[PDB]
Every structure is written in C-alpha cells, then in structure tokens.
Amino acid sequence: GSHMKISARNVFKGTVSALKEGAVNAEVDILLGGGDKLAAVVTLESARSLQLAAGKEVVAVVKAPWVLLMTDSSGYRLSARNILTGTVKTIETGAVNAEVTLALQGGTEITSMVTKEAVAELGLKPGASASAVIKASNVILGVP
Amino acid sequence: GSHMKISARNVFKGTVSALKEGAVNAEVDILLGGGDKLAAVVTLESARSLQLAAGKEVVAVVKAPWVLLMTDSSGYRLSARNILTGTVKTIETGAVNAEVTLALQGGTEITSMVTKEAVAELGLKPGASASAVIKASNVILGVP
Amino acid sequence: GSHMKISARNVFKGTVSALKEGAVNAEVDILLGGGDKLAAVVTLESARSLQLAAGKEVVAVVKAPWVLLMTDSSGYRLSARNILTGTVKTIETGAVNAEVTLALQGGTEITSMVTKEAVAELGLKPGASASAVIKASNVILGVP
C-alpha cells in the first residue's frame, strides 16, 4: 500500500497539462517529471468519473509490449500521438524477445519489449538514439 | 470445426447483459460462466453487423500480452473498464517473459503475459491475490 | 535514412483505397502490394494532419504481439476488421513465446508473436492454413 503495484514496466506520475473532451473520448495531455509530455486517450465516461481536470495529478501506465522503438523516421509522420526521443540505456535479451530501456531528456526511463531481431536490425546499443512510439489509446490512466 | 481455434490464451463464452451503443462505438457487457462480468468496446458498425443484442451469446477474445496484473491499487482508480480479482494458479517463466494464470471467483481462468521482472516485483506466487486489468477496447468479440 | 527503421515486425507500403471519416475517427482502407487489403482506424485529427486521401501512399505498421492467429473460425464472425488468410512460412520458438510468419496470397508476409502453447494447440506447421486477425485500431499509419 506504499505505492500502486502493477505489472506494467512503465508507470509515470505527472500533472494534466490539458484535457480535451469530445463527445466520445477525451485526450489527456500529461507533463511528466523530466519535462517529457505524454498524451493518453480515455473514454468520456472515464474522464468524468475520474474527475479529470487540467492541473490534477495522475499516473500513466503503459505495458512494455505496447511501445514501439524507432531509430529513423526517414521523413515519415505517424498517426501515433507519442514519439518520445531518448537514448538507449539498457538492453536485456531473451529467447525471441528483448527488453530495451531508453532514457528520455529530463531523466524519465521508458521500457519497450521488442523482438530480438528488431534490436539487431535497428543496431541498438547503449547510447544509440531512438524514439519510443506509443499510441495515446494504449495509455491507461490512474487517479489517486 | 468442433470449436474456434485462435491463438489467444483467453477465449470466454458468455451472454450479453447490456449493450450500450453511442454514435461511434458500442459498449458490450458480458456475463461469463463463473458470474464474472467483462466489458468490451466495439465499433457501431460491428455491433450492427454482428447483430448484438442483450441476451445473445458471444465469445470474448483477449490476447495474453494485453492483460496487466495488479496486486495493490493503493487507492488508485483506473481508466480501464475491467479489473477482475482472482488468485494466482499457475506461473511459467520464460527468458524475459512469463505466463501467469489467475483463477477468478466462479472459476474462470485468465492468462496474462508479463515480464519476469514484474512477477518478481509483484511477489506473485500460487495463492497470491491479484487483479487482471483489461481495457474494454482490447477485447475482441465473436458471434456464432 | 534509406528507409524508416522501426521495431515493428510488420511494415507495409500501400495506397489508400478508401477513406471514411466520421466525427471522431477515420477508417483508412489500404491496398497492399500483393493485393491484400488492410484497414486502419486513426483519429480524425490524424486524418486531417496526415493529409490522408484516397489514392495516396501510406505505410501501415503493426507490432507482432498485436496480431492474433486463427485456424478455424468454426462459423464465428469477429469484431476485428482484418482477417487475412495465408499459409505458415516460418516458426521460431522461444522460451514461452514464438514468432510465426504467414505468407498471404499475393506475397505479403505477416509476422505474429504468440505463446508457444498456441503454436502447439493450433497445430501450426509450415504450409498450414491460418488467418492473421488484426484490429484496425492496432494499425499505426505513416505518411511520407
């Protein structure tokens, strides 16, 4: 009971910087510790029931397998709302998968589960630049 | 052809207890075998084309990597619609991942794929209480 | 910078064959190389900002863990928009997971990450027929 204990490798505390409610869903923009911004999309019902408002503290939860890693966009613009650039800090290889941890500017760490082939193909290595790509619809929000 | 054969570790048969259609999506509340309830969100087009209605039998499909495990909410309320409490029945550890199976009250079993670090950090062990957290948008529905 | 380098095992180039915008989201129908069709659902804001239009070239990105495999629908109709039938080309087993690659008619290959139990239960083997099941909401789009 000292914290929330959840399996997700990424659990970030932040404050809502903007709340944009439409008739079906609500986009919640969150300012995390390091200055990193993350967007989450939740249902209108959740935005009302969780009592979301700009300035309120929230937790954003993202499972590792939901994070994609990108090293070269090659000019492409993507539909996913969150493209967080950082540097590779840790890689731990498994049998077919691997866990990659990136440090974002400001210090936040984000962890992604990708195939060991992707680590190979992307040329990941401690210090290498990469972006974590996360759809806002794959971010779960929590409110104290 | 004796059943539906799909990779998902979780395939549950149930009856629709409530159908709530909006102009874009439809929330389908499903009563599963053990008395467990699961919510799914599908498009309006799917609710019309599948002929959904309260009282009709459906199958809900959830891939293992889409299920988060939580042991202590610490007072937090989450945006995900499904928080199913149960007890740990089986854990099988892999290289970087692990498969955890929970028994819910009533008997339904739910299987989650998490990192082996999460199993360690959460202190999971046969008999330990935990909740499976599943967004309703990550439940696929099937109709005979 | 010769291509987009992203971890996703499935990155397909295609042309938009239909764009259907509603007040919240937009369904984008994509004709891939082999003649295979894939549907993606993106936000209205993304459809406007990416300048989507029928006839324009796009890339569709799907992470391996987001693809389900099905061998026998047994008559069931599912809520997921993409059901792509193909033949198994490659399986590589890990510790608890496995990577399965299917060849679709026309030549496109799709890769799925499933549990090694699912490979066993489905009786997958090179040449076996199977369908990749992908929600349209789990397809990320990119535009040059």
Q: How many angstroms separate the CA atoms of A104 and A118, rounded? A: 20
Q: How many angstroms separate the CA atoms of B130 and B72, rounded? A: 8
Short-list B130, B108, B90, CA closest to B38: B108
Check whether residue C75 and residue C129 sit in a common domain.
yes
Q: What is the CA radius of gyration of chain A?
A: 16
Check whether residue B141 and residue B130 sit in a common domain.
no
Size of interface B-C (CB pairs under 8 A): 92
Q: Give the nearest partner residue to B4 out of C66, C76, C79, using CB atoms.
A: C76
CB–CB contact B95 A95 (8 Å): yes
Check whether residue B9 and residue B55 sit in a common domain.
yes
Contacts of C36 (CB under 8 A, 6+ apart): C84, C104, C105, C106, C108
CB–CB contact A68 C140 (8 Å): yes
Check whether residue A116 and residue A140 sit in a common domain.
no
| Phi then psi dihedrals of residue A44, to 5 deg | -55, -45
Check whether residue C74 and residue C130 sit in a common domain.
yes
Q: Sheet containing A77-78: which strands, arranged edge to edge?
A: A77-78, C140-143, C57-62, C10-21, C25-32, C37-43
Number of domain units in chain C: 2
CB–CB contact A118 C61 (8 Å): no
**In which region does residue C55 sit, left (phi positive, over 0), alpha (psi from -120 to 50) or beta (all else)?**
left
Partner chains of A (3+ C-beta pairs under 8 Å): B, C
CB–CB contact C76 B143 (8 Å): yes
Q: Contact, B143 vs C74, CB < 8 A?
A: no
Size of interface A-B (CB pairs under 8 A): 92
Check whether residue C87 and residue C125 sit in a common domain.
yes
CB–CB contact B68 A64 (8 Å): no
Provide the residue count of chain A: 144
CB–CB contact A140 B78 (8 Å): yes
Chain A CB contacts of B22 below 8 Å: 24
Check whether residue A81 and residue A27 sit in a common domain.
no
CATH number for B113: 2.40.50.100
Chain C CB contacts of A94 below 8 Å: 94-95
CB–CB contact C8 A72 (8 Å): no
Q: How many angstroms separate the CA atoms of B98 and A52, rounded? A: 34
Provide the residue count of chain C: 144
Give the angle subtended at the CA of C14 by the CAs of C11 and C16, to the nearest 5°: 125
In sequence order, the β-bridge partners of residue B37 are B31
Numbers of helices and strands, H then E, in chain A: 2, 12
Check whether residue A77 and residue A122 sit in a common domain.
yes
Check whether residue A123 and residue A77 sit in a common domain.
yes
Check whether residue C60 and residue C106 sit in a common domain.
no
Residue A133: Cβ within 10 Å count: 26
Give the angle subtended at the CA of C90 by the CAs of C122 and B4, to the nearest 5°: 20
Residue C31: Cβ within 10 Å count: 14
Nearest CA in chain A to B131: A6
Give the angle subtended at the CA of C19 by the CAs of C18 and C23, to the nearest 5°: 150
Residues belonging to chain B with any Cβ–Cβ distance to chain C shorter than 8 Å: 1-9, 23-24, 40, 42-43, 46, 49-50, 59, 61, 63-65, 92-95, 97-99, 113, 137, 140-144
Q: How many angstroms separate the CA atoms of C19 and C17, rounded? A: 7
Check whether residue B103 and residue B74 sit in a common domain.
yes
Read off the tokens for C100: 């399965």
| Reported structure resolution in angstroms | 1.8
Q: How many angstroms separate the CA atoms of A32 and A15, rounded? A: 7
Short-list C65, C44, C60, C28, CA closest to C139: C60
Q: What range defines the domain where residue A109 resides?
A: 65-134
Check whether residue B43 and residue B29 sit in a common domain.
yes
Chain B CB contacts of A43 below 8 Å: 41, 79
CB–CB contact C7 A75 (8 Å): no
Read off the tokens for A127: 């210090």
Give chain C as a DSSP string.
Answer: --S-EES-SEEEEEEEEEEEE-SSEEEEEEEETTS-EEEEEEEHHHHHHTT--TT-EEEEEE-GGG-EEEEE-TT-EES-SEEEEEEEEEEEE-SSEEEEEEEETTS-EEEEEEEHHHHHHHT--TT-EEEEEE-GGG-EEEE-
